[PDB]
RNA sequence: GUACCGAAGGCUAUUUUCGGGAAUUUACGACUAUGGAGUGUACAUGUGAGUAGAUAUGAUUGUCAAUCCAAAGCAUACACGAUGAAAUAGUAAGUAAUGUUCGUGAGAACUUACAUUAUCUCGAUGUGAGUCACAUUUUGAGUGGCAGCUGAUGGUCCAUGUC
DNA sequence: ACATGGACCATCAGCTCCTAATGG
DNA sequence: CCATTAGGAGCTGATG
């Protein structure tokens, strides 16, 4: 049972400069490996495998030119990890799993630094502070939410990140699973929609978190901040005052607003899944929703993006696999929103803008409720 | 002491706490020195436009025919503003006392006591001395009530502005 | 069509051994 | 000298 415990940390200035330098070197190494591979193909030679690119770097390039040996000044493990995940892009493009590599490009916050447990005595953790191989003891803001070494827990590896003025660490731990739950309640089903987040085939209704006053106020604030930030770029285009500081401040503010909205939405999804799973059903059937096609509709794109259907599905699948539940999903073209629950009529004149379902037998119910009931008693499905 | 901003890892708290605090009620966080006229709202007003976009909805061999359907911008209305808007460059966001130095300024550093989650603080239990020490302890905890499975690669969408 | 600078979407995986240097 | 802590090599054979 692989897990992760992502927590915010408290580096010092000397540790902050180390983190920044390591990330910069890793980005440079990724780009350099890509370019050298391109040049080799241009000539007509074979493919360098990354594990051999490192050997070429250590024994055939770095001695040759003494100009750039700052590479062996930052941790030698993060550099190797960056090279390997650069070669993973190529090995995924050779197979038809992905597209051609993409040249990380200077300046973002998506590149992290990787550390591993090398010796039998590092990566020791307490209620406060953790020991990371590149930096030493690093303080931890939240106490107890990282498996300590006092109570027989071991960290395999980890990653240090940086998002909007804050720093985080994410460590992965093998967890033993106990308390085998016995599921015996009647099964349920949930329909995912845009008027409400979810409607369950038992009566429970979860409203759209995006239709609340707080999120609307946040969106207004974000639009105002973006409009104010775009004036500084226009001003910068004219003069020669290239010492942008208010631009950095505005960028930080925009990133903070985005992060806050993400926090609200993620908390809502996690708590909703918690309540649904704690209700303890035997099985649940959901859908095979296609979000790309729905997002191709211009007037539905923003709402569908802000609803986060696929993330909810993945987290629900993880929790179901963890709690011993079974997840059922149906075909992409299963007639859920058109089939009556009494006679089985598959009426076709159902307009997309009707909130009430009415067929010939006289059955009348909400469209979402009818869809949830159709989902709960589905016959053909394949378990996720 | 309201809307907002900083901190207490995240969400929430009308009856959690410590600070700053308005262009003041679907309510443009506050000051500093230059800078001189704009900035904000229309989720409680029209046109762009049945237009872009989507259709496991029908007919002939890409059109026809039915069902849902934007946004930018322009135009209007209202609000605040020469008691100083945008932009540029900075300052602070635990409490008291004393006296210097530094900066144009908001302010900062060096001393004292308090408070506080100071690479730890607290609780509990046991032993010993006469309230203080030494050990063990996460099934103990970090303002209440609640939840946290991350990384890599690629793809696709979105917002703001100029022409 | 350029820049700005974000988010979510699908699918696939999560590091060991041996040597060689560092502080009193 | 010495428990610690760092570095170098490893596979994969492929229409940037
Ligand atoms: Zn019927």
Author numbering: 4 to 387
What do the paper's sentences say?
TnpB is a RuvC domain-containing protein and predicted to be an ancestor of the Cas12 nucleases of CRISPR-Cas systems. Our biochemical data demonstrate that RAGATH-18-derived RNA (reRNA) interact with IS607 TnpB to form a novel programmable reRNA-guided DNase system. To the best of our knowledge, these IS607 TnpBs with an average size of 390 aa (330–433 aa) represent the smallest programmable endonucleases with activity in human cells identified thus far.
